[PDB]
Design an enzyme around this catalytic site. Structure first.
Site, PDB file in Angstrom:
ATOM      1  N   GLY A 214       8.618   2.203   7.483  1.00 21.55           N
ATOM      2  CA  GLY A 214       8.374   0.799   7.158  1.00 21.55           C
ATOM      3  C   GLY A 214       7.808   0.561   5.759  1.00 21.55           C
ATOM      4  O   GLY A 214       8.000   1.372   4.831  1.00 21.55           O
TER       5      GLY A 214
ATOM      6  N   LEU B   7       0.825  -1.203   0.000  1.00 18.65           N
ATOM      7  CA  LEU B   7       0.000   0.000   0.000  1.00 18.65           C
ATOM      8  C   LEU B   7       0.862   1.258   0.000  1.00 18.65           C
ATOM      9  O   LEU B   7       0.460   2.309  -0.503  1.00 18.65           O
ATOM     10  CB  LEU B   7      -0.935   0.007   1.214  1.00 18.65           C
ATOM     11  CG  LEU B   7      -2.071  -1.014   1.330  1.00 18.65           C
ATOM     12  CD1 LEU B   7      -2.626  -0.988   2.765  1.00 18.65           C
ATOM     13  CD2 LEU B   7      -3.182  -0.750   0.320  1.00 18.65           C
ATOM     14  N   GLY B   8       2.047   1.138   0.588  1.00 22.94           N
ATOM     15  CA  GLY B   8       2.954   2.258   0.796  1.00 22.94           C
ATOM     16  C   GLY B   8       4.187   1.843   1.578  1.00 22.94           C
ATOM     17  O   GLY B   8       4.213   0.781   2.223  1.00 22.94           O
TER      18      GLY B   8
ATOM     19  N   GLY C  94       8.356   3.575   3.167  1.00 22.70           N
ATOM     20  CA  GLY C  94       9.172   4.716   3.563  1.00 22.70           C
ATOM     21  C   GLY C  94      10.189   4.328   4.619  1.00 22.70           C
ATOM     22  O   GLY C  94      10.548   3.143   4.750  1.00 22.70           O
TER      23      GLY C  94
ATOM     24  N   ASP D 278       3.308  13.433  13.984  1.00 21.34           N
ATOM     25  CA  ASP D 278       3.387  13.456  12.531  1.00 21.34           C
ATOM     26  C   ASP D 278       2.024  13.641  11.873  1.00 21.34           C
ATOM     27  O   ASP D 278       1.680  12.925  10.936  1.00 21.34           O
ATOM     28  CB  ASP D 278       4.103  12.207  12.005  1.00 21.34           C
ATOM     29  CG  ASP D 278       4.687  12.408  10.596  1.00 21.34           C
ATOM     30  OD1 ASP D 278       4.795  13.560  10.109  1.00 21.34           O
ATOM     31  OD2 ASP D 278       5.031  11.393   9.974  1.00 21.34           O
TER      32      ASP D 278
HETATM   33  N1  LIG Z   1       3.117   7.162   6.286  1.00 21.56           N
HETATM   34  C1  LIG Z   1       2.285   6.156   5.588  1.00 21.56           C
HETATM   35  C2  LIG Z   1       2.904   5.742   4.241  1.00 21.56           C
HETATM   36  C3  LIG Z   1       2.019   4.702   3.521  1.00 21.56           C
HETATM   37  C4  LIG Z   1       0.619   5.294   3.242  1.00 21.56           C
HETATM   38  N2  LIG Z   1      -0.190   4.341   2.440  1.00 21.56           N
HETATM   39  C5  LIG Z   1      -1.413   3.828   2.627  1.00 21.56           C
HETATM   40  C6  LIG Z   1      -2.344   3.879   1.586  1.00 21.56           C
HETATM   41  N3  LIG Z   1      -3.543   3.320   1.743  1.00 21.56           N
HETATM   42  C7  LIG Z   1      -3.882   2.704   2.888  1.00 21.56           C
HETATM   43  C8  LIG Z   1      -2.958   2.611   3.937  1.00 21.56           C
HETATM   44  C9  LIG Z   1      -3.261   2.003   5.185  1.00 21.56           C
HETATM   45  C10 LIG Z   1      -4.353   1.155   5.387  1.00 21.56           C
HETATM   46  C11 LIG Z   1      -4.614   0.615   6.662  1.00 21.56           C
HETATM   47  C12 LIG Z   1      -3.783   0.929   7.738  1.00 21.56           C
HETATM   48  C13 LIG Z   1      -2.681   1.766   7.549  1.00 21.56           C
HETATM   49  C14 LIG Z   1      -1.858   2.113   8.628  1.00 21.56           C
HETATM   50  C15 LIG Z   1      -0.508   2.464   8.551  1.00 21.56           C
HETATM   51  C16 LIG Z   1       0.204   2.822   9.707  1.00 21.56           C
HETATM   52  O1  LIG Z   1      -0.375   2.863  10.824  1.00 21.56           O
HETATM   53  O2  LIG Z   1       1.402   3.110   9.560  1.00 21.56           O
HETATM   54  C17 LIG Z   1      -2.454   2.304   6.284  1.00 21.56           C
HETATM   55  N4  LIG Z   1      -1.742   3.187   3.767  1.00 21.56           N
HETATM   56  C18 LIG Z   1      -0.017   5.707   4.570  1.00 21.56           C
HETATM   57  C19 LIG Z   1       0.885   6.708   5.324  1.00 21.56           C
END
Ligand SMILES: N[C@H]1CC[C@H](Nc2cncc(-c3cccc(/C=C/C(=O)O)c3)n2)CC1
EC number: 2.7.11.1
Length: 274
Positions: free
Chosen positions: A18, A12-13, A15, A135
């Site tokens: 992680g 999903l993403g 950095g 953040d």
């Molecule tokens: N700093 C982060 C980088 C990845 C990004 N990408 C995405 C895109 N779509 C959905 C999600 C997603 C879905 C469900 C849970 C999470 C939680 C991430 C976390 O707590 O780090 C993140 N994450 C979110 C923000």
């Protein structure tokens, strides 16, 4: 056992924080996010109430764990020789707020008001539980598209909330306050309010107000898009150069721009097509 519990989907993403993957809990077909964090990259280590060493991020997520849907829920976690794997809630369908604003541009004020209110509720929930996020930004907010509900994510830069000075920081620089840029010193709640000002500007203008240190320090806000006088006022207040001149959370939510918020569901129906 992890492998027998979750089916791993696509990335999903990623950095420095992680790498986050889409997953499904094999037990009941529940949508999850599987976040991997390298041990070598964990700067802040935490104390579990049973005395186990985990990343502070696990500490903070457990502390905010609740039926309250405004903050992402930690479902489970695993330790591996070289990493931690965090199993997180995943709304479906969902869109990250950064991507939402990238696609749609500057948000209508009715929508920004609804979104900003929910972020305030989520951040107040964190602080009430003794957690400082550190953040807050568009990228760290997910939109539950069916329900019109926002979720704060990524507690990887967070700390226990204290009333004394923070002299460390590893959140996003362009959302960090002038006192951090100039002195390497901030207090939690007023720095949070600063980041909230950046975020609100970002919602109503479609981009952040400052790119460079010199601009953050000057604190001069220019509106590139048409933004109502009340919204401008609230933004400029959050972005006061002196930390003590910033509004409290109560003052933000009592601000005239913040009145008559839409419910999340109403928000979905009007603005998210739902
Ligand atoms: N700093 C982060 C980088 C990845 C990004 N990408 C995405 C895109 N779509 C959905 C999600 C997603 C879905 C469900 C849970 C999470 C939680 C991430 C976390 O707590 O780090 C993140 N994450 C979110 C923000």
């Amino acid at each position: 056992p992890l492998e027998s519990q979750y089916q791993v989907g696509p990335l999903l993403g990623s950095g420095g924080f992680g790498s986050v993957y889409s997953g499904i809990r094999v037990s009941d077909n529940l949508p999850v996010a599987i976040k991997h964090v390298e041990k070598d990259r964990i700067s802040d280590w935490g104390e579990l109430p049973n005395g186990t060493r985990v990343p502070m991020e696990v500490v903070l997520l457990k502390k905010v764990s609740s039926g309250f849907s405004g903050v992402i829920r930690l479902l489970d976690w695993f330790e591996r020789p070289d990493s931690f794997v965090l199993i997180l809630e995943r709304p479906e369908p969902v869109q990250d707020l950064f991507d939402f604003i990238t696609e749609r541009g500057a948000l209508q004020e009715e929508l920004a008001r609804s979104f900003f209110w929910q972020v305030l509720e989520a951040v107040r929930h964190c602080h009430n539980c003794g957690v400082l996020h550190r953040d807050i930004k568009d990228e760290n907010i997910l939109i539950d598209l069916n329900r019109g509900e926002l979720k704060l994510i990524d507690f990887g830069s967070g700390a226990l909330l204290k009333d004394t000075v923070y002299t460390d920081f590893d959140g996003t620089r362009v959302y960090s306050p002038p006192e951090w840029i100039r002195y390497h010193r901030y207090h939690g709640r007023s720095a949070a309010v600063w980041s909230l000002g950046i975020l609100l500007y970002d919602m109503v203008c479609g981009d952040i107000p400052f790119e460079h240190d010199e601009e953050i320090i000057r604190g001069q806000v220019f509106f590139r898009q048409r933004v109502s006088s009340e919204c401008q006022h609230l933004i400029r207040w959050c972005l006061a150069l002196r930390p003590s001149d910033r509004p409290t959370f109560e003052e933000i939510q009592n601000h005239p721009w913040m009145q008559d918020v839409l419910l999340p569901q109403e928000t979905a129906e009007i603005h998210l097509h739902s």
